[PDB]
A paper describes a structure:
FapC is the main fibre-forming component, with FapB and FapE present in the fibres as minor subunits. [name] is the membrane protein pore component through which the FapB, FapC and FapE substrates are secreted. Therefore, to provide insight into mechanistic basis of Fap secretion, we solved the crystal structure of the transmembrane domain (TD) of the transporter [name] (FapF83–406), termed [name]β from hereon. The TD of [name] comprises a 12-stranded plugged β-barrel ([name]β), which forms a tightly packed trimer within the crystal.
Removing the N-terminal domain comprising a 39-residue helical region followed by a 42-residue disordered linker and adding an OmpA signal sequence and a hexahistidine tag to allow purification directly from the E. coli outer membrane (OM) led to larger, well-diffracting and reproducible crystals for [name]β. Incorporating a L273M mutation into this construct yielded selenomethionine-substituted crystals that produced sufficient anomalous signal for phase determination. The structure was solved by single-wavelength anomalous dispersion (SAD) to 2.5 Å resolution with an Rfree of 26%. The trimer interface is extensive, with a prominent phenylalanine ladder (F325, F335 and F367) making hydrophobic contacts between protomers around the C3 axis. A notable feature of the structure is the presence of a 13-residue helical plug between residues A89 and G101 that is inserted into the lumen of the pore from the periplasmic side with the C-terminal end pointing in and the N terminus out. Strikingly, the helix is immediately followed by a turn with a double phenylalanine motif (102FF103) before the N terminus loops back into the periplasmic space. This hairpin structure constricts the pore and represents a closed conformation, which would not likely allow passage of molecules larger than water through the pore. An evolutionarily conserved salt-bridge interaction between E98 and K401 pins the plug to the internal wall of the barrel. The plug helix is also flanked on one side by a specific electrostatic interaction between E111 and R157 linking neighbouring strands within the barrel lumen. The fact that we were unable to observe channel activity for [name]β in the absence of urea indicates a highly stable plugged conformation, and may suggest that the crystal structure corresponds to a final step in secretion in which the channels are stably closed.
Residue numbers in the entry:
A (entry chain B): 88 to 120, 141 to 245, 249 to 406
B (entry chain C): 88 to 121, 144 to 181, 194 to 245, 253 to 406
C (entry chain A): 88 to 120, 143 to 180, 194 to 244, 253 to 406
């Protein structure tokens, strides 16, 4: 099996079957863009360890490290004039996000009739800086966060399914997953500087799926085209002594079109560049990533 | 031969020569965001008859399911209802040779069978219902061209939609008023260009772009002169990535992604079509 | 080397090393969308002298036609130049088994287009600009290498804008304010992959991103102040082809999808490089 084919399957399935222990370093850049303008430059360094057992089971742990920069622009401004200034920027120095781990089980091996199929579960912990309690600090009509979050503040569990099959030369693949967020509590759920309100949060659950095609171009390179869509239900807050109330407009549909490659730098090292184009306003405008899975 | 080649030509030309009588079941999902979020599904039912690889006759019945959500949130929906029924005649006037392209000329007649937008009232403010068609007759002559330059298959198409003037009992969306009036929906010009590839015996892949340009629409209330609706013009651009997959010798699966490039296009459109050859 | 391969390299590198002289005619349409819709056409005229597949000298004259509609009133610019520019390029690495084709270049752009500063709001602009009003110098790097059948390529450049002055920096019809302007510098890069499909055709997929720093103004008798929201990130996804019409004439269609709000929705272009 050519390296390109192996690397392709790893990328499409999330199941790294060539080896035994592997470590992937990833760098990702993502770009986002009372009436005010927010521009965000977000970098994520991903550190992922994987153990593949007999091409059947896989265990992984991922530690994301988040660097962020948001710029807030008002047109308040200076003072009361609907089209004047105003620029405030806020940043987060490199900090851990939400640590997570996954178990995957390959329940179908590809044959003439069957796909490679992998079932998986992913458990994510709330280790990142949560968004709840972050205060908006007041130019007169421009309020800006005192800090930026690096995670969503809750535990979550994500069972998933991946399928891959070669119809030479096209490799078709698809995937689907469901994220259940666990309810949790916080000392402060208010972003009012003047107040402190304890409360609980239920983050809306989400459904994710993707399909795509990939090609092995030569011994060392593959290319991939895919689409994906994430659908998130609205989120709810319960202040102490209050009831559950939904946050209007917290629901989301984040669609992406992805073009990527796999490049075998050696037997052990792959370079995986990818572009994800945001198709909806809930997605970043675009996302560039470069991943370096290394096999040992 | 190969199936992939046939299926791709069908896709690129709109002329299905597989091929005598065929029935195509299509499912389409389209996503819009204005605050209004729209999830729109269309089940397409299309019958086609290809006569001697020269003439093609078809009827299409679209069935529309819609959910719009309005955020202060209130939601409005349309249960599965028929849209604008239409039929088409196509004539292949050039057959592909070393020098010639496959070229098809066509006309499509669309009837106002869907629930029209004109009576629909804004109720304290969301619509009481969602339309399923545009409320007018339209006629669309079109042109398609396809040619293989091995292994690239280049294609392009162009069409013009003339909308017929029509009259309605109510043109107003004010709940308190009823105003009869006439409507001229702005005509539109559509074109696209692309490239496709046969990957193997059974599969093709396609990349294309298209753009629709619609002129302004006009209203005449009873008594009453013609007024342009100054913001009714549109430019809807799309980038398409698609496949054809020969499931058997009778069934093709056609997945397509259309990415909206402009604000008048849905954010994205996913479709899955299943042409079946009897 | 097949014509497709040559045309491919020319497109990816900007270095047209298969002839002494070339002239490229390009037509570009771009679409942008109180509401404003803009239809913008640019006719590009570019002459190149390639010396021994080692050096290249070029001049580009863009001719700009523009139409903006404000919602309804419309404003237009009849065909007018163009920030004229020229470039010098040097191929410092020739592709071998180990090395890429690599070209270093410098591009000098002059402020010949109608500048935006001083254009009055009358509410709609009285006119539309065709250039940015300043000199700029852009050193750049291009790299291309075949890993059969994939041709990988990439490019990167930095634009330094020269400070300049204008008689009027205000768009207020009632005022005239002289001032100096430092246009924010920019960093540009792209990467992509291309394929020779046959003797005569190639296809390309690429991405690019332009990052522009904020600009600053000094009105006369005032101090330097940064122009909020003048910073920009214009990202593009490109799908393109090269088609050999003759051994001299290539047709180059390209679609550039804007990925950010600082980019046009989309850009369709058609370029016709001609080797003499
Ligand atoms: C970039 C979007 C391109 C679409 C990706 C294709 C995968 C999604 O398709 C869903 C249905 O496909 C099932 C394929 O079934 C195989 C049939 O072939 C059997 C005969 O050889
Ligand atoms: C407008 C319908 C015309 C179709 C009639 C075609 C007759 C062809 O005869 C086949 C030999
Ligand atoms: C199902 C649509 C029918 C189209 C109009 C009539 C076509 C008649 O063709 C007859 C051909 O027979 C020739 C022998
Ligand atoms: C996303 C795609 C971007 C670039 C696609 C450009 C496609 C250029 O194709 C033009 C289409 O024209 C179709 C006609 O083909 C037949 C040519 O007829 C000439 C006879 O030799
Ligand atoms: C067919 C047109 C050739 C035009 C050559 C343009 C020369 C560019 O000028 C700058 C180079 O100066 C150093 C020589
Ligand atoms: C952030 C680095 C994570 C390293 C985690 C490695 C997962 C495999 C653990 C051993 C399984 C027995
Ligand atoms: C750029 C981030 C995209 C997020 C949307 C997710 C799309 C596909 C979801 C299924 C993933 C399942 N998998 C491969 C983990 O098993
Ligand atoms: C993983 C490859 C990353 C590609 C490089 C993208 C650079 C984006 C830089 C944005 C931040 C710079 N700036 C000027 C806004 O400060
Ligand atoms: C995806 C929505 C497309 C809307 C605009 C389409 C422009 C195509 C013009 C003529 C169509 C002929 N064709 C390709 C169907 O054979
Ligand atoms: C040549 C055959 C053309 C297709 C004919 C299909 C009839 C449509 C019946 C579907 C009914 C839909 N609905 C939901 C309103 O009940
Ligand atoms: C309104 C018409 C709807 C479509 C007509 C479908 C007819 C079903 C025929 C089933 C038998 C087909 N076959 C090839 C398996 O024999
Ligand atoms: C046409 C839009 C401009 C966007 C800026 C980014 C362009 C990156 C590609 C530069 C190509 C340079 N060169 C010398 C290789 O041709
Ligand atoms: Na959107
Ligand atoms: Na737009
Ligand atoms: Na944007």
């Amino acid at each position: 099996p050519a390296q390109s084919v192996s690397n392709l399957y790893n990328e499409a399935s999330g199941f790294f079957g060539n080896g035994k222990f592997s470590f992937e370093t990833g760098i990702t850049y993502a770009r986002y863009d009372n009436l005010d303008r927010i521009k965000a430059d977000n970098w994520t360094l991903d550190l992922t360890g994987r153990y593949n057992l007999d091409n059947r089971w896989q265990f992984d742990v991922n530690v994301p490290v988040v660097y962020r920069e948001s710029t807030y622009q008002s047109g308040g401004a200076s003072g009361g004039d609907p089209q004047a200034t105003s620029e405030e920027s806020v940043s987060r120095d490199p900090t851990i996000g939400d640590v997570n781990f996954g178990i995957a089980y390959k329940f179908l091996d590809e044959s003439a009739t069957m796909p490679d199929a992998v079932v998986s579960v992913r458990v994510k912990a709330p280790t990142g800086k949560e968004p709840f309690g972050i205060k908006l600090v007041r130019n007169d009509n421009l309020y800006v966060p005192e800090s930026l979050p690096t995670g969503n503040g809750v535990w979550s569990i994500t069972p998933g399914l991946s399928m891959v099959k070669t119809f030479d030369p096209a490799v078709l693949f698809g995937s689907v997953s469901y994220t259940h967020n666990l309810e949790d509590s916080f000392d402060d759920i208010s972003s009012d500087v003047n107040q402190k309100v304890g409360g609980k949060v239920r983050l809306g659950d989400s459904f994710q799926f993707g399909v795509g095609v990939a090609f092995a171009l030569n011994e060392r390179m593959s290319m991939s085209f895919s689409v994906s869509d994430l659908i998130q239900r609205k989120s709810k807050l319960k202040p102490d002594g209050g009831g559950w109330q939904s946050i209007v407009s917290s629901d989301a549909n984040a669609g992406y079109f992805n073009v990527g490659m796999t490049i075998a730098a050696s037997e052990n090292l792959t370079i995986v560049p990818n572009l994800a184009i945001g198709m909806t306003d809930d997605a970043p405008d675009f996302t560039f990533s470069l991943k370096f899975p290394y096999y040992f």
